Design a protein around this ligand. Structure first.
Ligand SMILES: Nc1ncnc2c1ncn2[C@@H]1O[C@H](COP(=O)(O)OP(=O)(O)O)[C@@H](O)[C@H]1O
Ligand code: BEF
Ligand SMILES: [Mg+2]
Lengths: 399, 182, 54, 396
């Protein structure tokens, strides 16, 4: 292998992952947001922010670095974050080592403008020697031994569906849902509000709650039902009637208990109410009358495959993609999720056999994007990736 | 962990040799009675008059379990019934020393059907008998009570392939097998 | 005895430096620090016992 | 390979450095060498630096290389290792004179590291050990792992390492230190001192430090029976004290607990998490304060245990007056425990386990160095091939 050690940085819209290419896990996972506390001042890091957030001090406000595109939109802040990472976590001059960072799949447009802002940050400001940009869905797929794959990423910003054929990304078939993890935070909060008393500028408390009890609730209460929930209900009812009538147990009546710490208070949901939260990802027409069933994850996956079949047979691409389905993302770890994504895919494409792949290790999908970039950085040849040097920048600067 | 275990064994030997000399130099079996009663506490709580402390969880019922059908109720399998059930609640084993003709089959049938008529777990549970009587035990599993299935093992490997190939996923109330098939 | 010679007589051979390196395919346009192997051509003593516990 | 006479363990910390050369073979002994962690740095006109054990003619400056556990001066730190290492060679070389053919012929080194050390620092140290000290075999063992290996080798646990000015919190899952969860709070033993100064204004520092280190200072959660009690100055002066001797530990205990909670809550595999919460390991000088560990446990319970809120439970029991089943929660921890110490290291039992990290290293080094497999340390072979980078092919 090569005589080098890279810094690997992944700026997700929710989490930021950083570490060196020579070890199996990242040195740090910190929030892709910061507190601006006021003479201004910028707080980064999971415990630093949760401490400051709990202080409940006026003028403290949380801002974000990554928009819903998965792309950085506040570049002055991003530099401060990178400085923070290099200074306090990796503890190395940014000038020494090659850098590997991620971008999300796009349709192609915002690409050049981003690349430029990265030149300015990597070169003008940090003095990085050289960097590679890997495309998240692509790296994750490669890290998994796959050159062609339908990559279904369910993160905080929403679902990102990306067909990848023979190492190439099909941009026009790239699809980004708007409903994911962060959406789930909103719904858990709005729904539980009356039991916990509670029912931008108030960003600090929203954030702190999202990062504390709401995060635990998601990891322990929510489940995704295997089949359209409204149907599951009608069925379980229809069956329940017969057990009852017959003599003279509906699974949705099981209760689940969550200790809510801030008030030392038990919150009990029935299994249906637990299934209900993720149902919105699949049938978002159930919150507002302003969402079409087509904004739901099932129709969306289908849409993106069909748009893959338009290249540039279809019942071949369909077959390729569907035998290499990759399910990934923090939110994809919610119990029942893989199976519903599968059921939802299988019924839009009955003629085909689906085979899906997913990291089964809890940690590794939360940071599978970073894991992907890592396996790119450990590729044995410098010729395997585009490596931008200070040169490239100079030459772009000409007219 | 294993290294630790050996370091611990070695120390124990060392300390033991030290104490042994120290305690004997300057500068009958009722230990089984009290110690094995406290050991009965060791099985009961720690594992999960001997008429009381060993039997401490008490009960008796002279009514049969509702699953038993087509049988006459005598007095013996009652006291023996809740006697073995008394071995069950305390988490204890036992041996049946009886003469013959007292219906070990009855005590097993009414045993499982009463116990897991209450708890409803009802399986997986293993029963093993001589090949001389096998379909017999299934015959008292037929007329003397329904609703608890049986997995037998007999004949050529083919019928078995059907049986443990169907039940390979491990769903059944009871397995009725014989000696060499384990 | 001379500390340096004590070091020399115990425990009985390359050397590395941490320096700029420029990979090739000829040479890529960029640099980066790494641990390179060098070519052919590239005080006191304290008394324990004070520090022993007693 | 290898002589047990020859194994060298060094455990450097901000104030002092525990050292041992040779393992006893019968049982493990608590390290007897404790060298203050500092070196003198004379500056020689022309720019360069020289390093001595004493202020040479009052010409040298005093460098303290490790602060808050972090290496702040990597050059003085390596010079300090050499100073230790050389001293050991001289000492043994006198006493026995055939030493360079026996005890000093092949010296493997185990260096206990701190979570905060750079990769850059770890590589430089590796280079120093192979190039300057001309040693041939090196393990760099993280402090956290030493901890878990001493504690009857725990696959999942949390290390709470209470220093003087900071406390490290370090979760271990599947025998791996979880770097992204690791952290320290800027708070430690001195906090107790500080709490006490506020409670006893008319005392001074040495008086307060003496109380903290006395038999009558404990954390509560027979001495506790007396309103007042007595203890003796560093200078023999008798001092009486009231309820203050059961105070001063609280603010620290609360801070550590809040941190432990946020940390373990970010373990993603709940099945791992349950295990960690059941093997809390507390280490460091402070922890030898009578009552401290149990008090810290008590607080983790009070703050984090998942269990039915008492009022809720009291209602349900009134309701049933007209047996109450246990409410099951989906969260962890429903069980919190301190990991069980091994009771079979007699010398260690005698002296307490505040420094048990070192026993971790005695065990690892014996394992590793008295068995052929070279999987967990850097060898000359390896150094010759990859250099300091060799280090990353034997991480645990
Ligand atoms: N109450 C009863 N009424 C009629 N027959 C009984 C009764 N109890 C036991 N039996 C007879 O006992 C036999 C079962 O006894 P068995 O299980 O062989 O005892 P063991 O196993 O102790 O030899 C049955 O054939 C049955 O005819
Ligand atoms: F009922 Be006996 F076993 F013939
Ligand atoms: Mg019989």
């Amino acid at each position: 292998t090569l005589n080098r050690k890279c810094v690997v940085i992944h700026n997700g819209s929710h989490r930021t992952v950083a570490g060196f290419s020579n070890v199996e896990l990242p040195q740090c996972i910190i929030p892709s947001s910061y507190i601006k506390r006021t003479e201004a001042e910028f707080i980064f890091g999971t415990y630093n922010m949760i401490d400051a957030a709990a202080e409940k001090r006026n003028g403290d406000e949380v801002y974000t670095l990554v928009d819903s595109q998965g792309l950085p939109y506040n570049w002055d802040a991003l530099e401060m974050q990178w400085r923070y990472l290099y200074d306090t976590q990796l503890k190395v001059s940014p000038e020494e080592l090659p850098l590997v960072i991620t971008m999300p799949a796009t349709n192609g447009k915002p690409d050049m403008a981003i690349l430029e802002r990265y030149y300015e940050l990597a070169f003008d400001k940090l003095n990085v020697p050289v960097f590679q940009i890997v495309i998240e869905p692509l790296a994750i797929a490669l890290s998994m031994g796959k050159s062609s794959a339908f990559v279904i990423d369910i993160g905080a910003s929403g679902c990102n569906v990306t067909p990848i054929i023979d190492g190439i990304v099909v941009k026009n078939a790239v699809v980004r849902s708007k409903f994911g993890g962060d959406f789930l935070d909103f719904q858990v909060h709005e729904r539980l509000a009356p039991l916990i008393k509670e029912e931008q500028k108030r960003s600090t408390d929203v954030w702190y709650e999202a990062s504390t009890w709401i995060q635990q609730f998601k990891s322990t209460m929510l489940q995704v039902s295997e089949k359209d929930l409204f149907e599951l209900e009608r069925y379980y009812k229809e069956q329940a009637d017969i057990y009852a009538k017959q003599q003279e147990n509906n699974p949705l009546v099981q209760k689940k208990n969550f200790l809510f710490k801030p008030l030392n208070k038990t919150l009990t949901l029935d299994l249906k109410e637990c299934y209900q939260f993720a149902e919105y990802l699949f049938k978002p027409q159930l919150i507002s009358d302003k969402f079409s069933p087509e904004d739901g994850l099932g129709p969306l996956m289908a849409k993106s495959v069909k748009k893959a079949g338009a290249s540039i047979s279809p019942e071949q691409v369909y077959s390729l993609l569907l035998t290499n389905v990759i399910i990934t993302g923090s939110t994809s770890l919610i119990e029942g999720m893989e199976q519903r994504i599968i059921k939802e895919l299988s019924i839009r494409f009955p003629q085909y056999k689906l085979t899906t792949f997913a990291n089964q290790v809890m940690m590794d999908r939360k940071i599978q994007g970073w894991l992907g970039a890592l396996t790119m950085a450990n590729l044995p040849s410098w010729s395997l990736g585009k490596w931008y040097s200070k040169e490239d920048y100079e030459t772009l600067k000409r007219d | 962990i294993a290294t630790h275990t050996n370091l611990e064994r070695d120390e124990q030997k060392r300390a033991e040799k030290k104490a042994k000399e120290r305690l004997q130099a300057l500068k009958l079996l009722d230990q089984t009675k009290d110690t094995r009663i406290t050991h009965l506490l060791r099985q009961t709580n720690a594992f999960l008059d001997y008429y009381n402390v060993a039997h401490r969880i008490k009960e008796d019922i002279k009514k049969q379990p509702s699953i038993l059908v087509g049988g006459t109720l005598k007095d013996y399998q009652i006291k023996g019934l809740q006697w073995m059930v008394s071995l069950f609640n305390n988490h204890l084993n036992g041996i049946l020393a009886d003469e013959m003709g007292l219906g070990k089959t009855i005590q097993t049938i009414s045993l499982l059907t009463y116990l897991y008529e209450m708890k409803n777990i009802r399986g997986p549970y293993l029963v093993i008998v001589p090949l001389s009587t096998l379909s017999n035990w299934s015959s008292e599993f037929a007329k003397w009570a329904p609703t608890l299935r049986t997995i037998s093992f007999k004949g050529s490997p083919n019928e078995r392939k059907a049986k443990q190939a169907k039940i390979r996923a491990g769903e059944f109330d009871v397995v009725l097998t014989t000696f060499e098939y384990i | 005895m001379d500390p340096q010679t004590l070091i020399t007589k115990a425990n009985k051979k390359e050397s590395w430096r941490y320096d700029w390196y420029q990979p090739s395919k000829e040479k890529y346009p960029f640099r980066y620090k790494t641990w390179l192997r060098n070519q052919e051509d590239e005080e006191d003593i304290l008394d324990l016992k004070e520090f022993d516990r007693r | 390979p290898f002589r047990q006479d020859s194994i060298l363990i060094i455990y450097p910390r901000s104030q002092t450095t525990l050292v041992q050369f040779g393992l006893n073979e019968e049982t493990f002994t608590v390290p007897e060498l404790e060298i203050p962690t500092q070196i003198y740095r004379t500056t020689r006109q022309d720019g360069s630096y020289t390093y001595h054990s004493t202020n040479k003619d009052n010409k040298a400056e005093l460098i303290k290389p490790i602060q808050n556990g972090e290496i702040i001066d990597i050059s003085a730190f390596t010079q300090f290792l050499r100073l230790i290492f050389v001293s050991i060679l001289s000492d043994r070389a006198n006493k026995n004179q055939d030493a360079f053919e026996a005890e000093l012929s092949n010296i493997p080194l185990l260096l206990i590291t701190h979570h905060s050390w750079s990769q850059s620092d770890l590589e430089i140290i590796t280079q120093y050990v192979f190039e300057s000290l001309e040693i041939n075999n090196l393990i760099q063992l993280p402090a956290s792992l030493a901890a878990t290996y001493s504690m009857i080798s725990l696959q999942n646990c949390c290390i709470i390492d209470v220093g003087t000015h900071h406390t490290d919190i370090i979760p271990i899952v599947d025998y791996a230190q979880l770097d992204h969860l690791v952290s320290s709070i800027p708070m430690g033993g001195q906090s107790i001192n500080d709490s006490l100064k506020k409670l006893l204004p008319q005392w001074d520092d040495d008086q307060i430090e003496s109380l903290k280190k006395s038999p009558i200072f404990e954390v509560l959660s027979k001495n506790s029976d007396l309103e007042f009690n007595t203890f003796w100055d560093e200078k023999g002066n008798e001092i009486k004290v009231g309820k203050q001797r059961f105070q001063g530990c609280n603010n620290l205990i609360k801070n550590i607990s809040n941190r432990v909670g946020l940390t373990l809550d970010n373990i993603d595999d709940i099945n791992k998490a349950k295990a960690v919460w059941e093997n809390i390991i507390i280490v460091g000088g402070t922890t030898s304060i009578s009552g401290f560990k149990e008090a810290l446990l008590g607080q983790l319970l009070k703050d984090h245990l998942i269990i039915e809120p008492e009022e809720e439970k009291s209602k349900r029991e009134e309701e049933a007056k007209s047996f109450v089943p246990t409410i099951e929660y989906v969260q962890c921890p429903t069980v919190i425990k301190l990991a069980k110490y091994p009771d079979y290291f007699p010398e260690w039992k005698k002296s307490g386990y505040s420094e048990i990290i070192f026993l971790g290293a005695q065990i690892v080094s014996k394992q590793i160095f008295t068995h052929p497999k070279d999987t967990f340390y850097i060898t000359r072979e390896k150094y010759n091939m990859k250099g300091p980078a060799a280090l990353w092919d034997v991480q645990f």
